[PDB]
Amino acid sequence: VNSFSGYLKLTDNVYIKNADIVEEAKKVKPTVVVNAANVYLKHGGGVAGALNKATNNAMQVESDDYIATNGPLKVGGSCVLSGHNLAKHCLHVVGPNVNKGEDIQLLKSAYENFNQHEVLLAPLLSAGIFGADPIHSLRVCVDTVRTNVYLAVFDKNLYDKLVSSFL
């Protein structure tokens, strides 16, 4: 049993809810929250900007030190950093950004990072300002992630379309 409430069950391991991931993280304090990161960990907008704002920029400060030591992530890759006030850990995952012309086949590689964690609170990778089709992102998630994933979808209209169209 876990703390996640109000989520619709899609499969054995994947759950979904219309929720603000920031507000959900603040309530649950999950072991892992996933950030929709870019390779530079520049948390300007979208999910990343919202998570970073909720940490009072401490996420960005930590991320800048990580990049100064390690250099940029790979598209499809990830790193584990602090969850600050939101979670124990933040898994920063880089899905491909269609608005930069990145290979959508890298979305499966991005979701494979989730399999290193038994339970996660996450957004749909490459959705929103990353430009991918969220219906596609949900299909890749279900077909790739084997650990227990609780998906927060910010937009009510999109949430209802993801559920209604789910095969």
Ligand X SMILES: Nc1noc2ccccc12
Q: Determine the interface stretch with ligand X among 16-24, 88-96, 104-112, 133-141 (rule: CB under 6 A).
A: 16-24
Closest CA to 17 of 112, 124, 118: 124
Minimum separation from the CB atom of position 157 to ligand X (A):
14
Number of amino acids touching ligand X (CB under 6 A): 8
Contact between 128 and ligand X by CB under 6 A: the answer reads yes
Interface with ligand X (CB under 6 A), residue from 20, 62, 64, 112: 20
Pairwise CA distance, residues 147 & 118, whole Å = 5
Residue 154 binds to ligand X (criterion: CB under 6 A): yes
> Interface with ligand X by CB under 6 A: which range of 8-16, 19-27, 113-121, 133-141?
19-27
**Residue 100, token pair as written in the block:** 């930069």
82-121 binders of ligand X (CB under 6 A): none
- Does residue 46 belong to the site contacting ligand X (CB under 6 A)? yes
Contact 93, 35 (CB under 8 A): yes
Of 34, 39, 41, 50, the residue at the interface with ligand X (CB under 6 A) is 50
Residue number, nearest CB to ligand X: 50
21 binding ligand X? (CB under 6 A)? yes
- DSSP states along 113-167: GGGGSSEEEEPPTT-GGG---HHHHHHHHHHH--SEEEEEES-HHHHHHHHHT--
- Other CB atoms within 10 A of residue 138 CB: 23
> Toward ligand X, which CB reaches closer, 15 or 154?
154
Residues 6+ apart with CB under 8 A from 57: none
Identify the bridge partners of residue 92 per DSSP, sorted by sequence position: 35, 79
Q: Give the footprint of ligand X on this chain (CB under 6 A).
A: 20-22, 46-47, 50, 128, 154
